[PDB]
Amino acid sequence: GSSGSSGTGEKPYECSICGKSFTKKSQLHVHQQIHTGEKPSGPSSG
């Protein structure tokens, strides 16, 4: 978070991966795609 305009009511749809926000659910759905690369898992499970 940040110290400034806290406690306002950011868009109803806010990404958790990056932290972006979207006023249209759909937008978020498609956006999430952008996060189809970086993975928390290092080694490829067998």
The contact set with Zn ion (CB under 5 A) reads 15, 17-18, 20
Residues 3-27 as b/e (b if ≥16 CB within 10 A, e otherwise) read eeeeeeeeeebeeeeeeeebeeeee
- Contact, 35 vs 24, CB < 8 A? no
For Zn ion, the closer of residues 11 and 20 by Cβ is 20
**Least Å distance between CB 24 and Zn ion?**
14
Smallest distance, Zn ion to C-beta of residue 31, A: 6
Least distance from Zn ion to the Cβ atom of residue 33, Å: 9
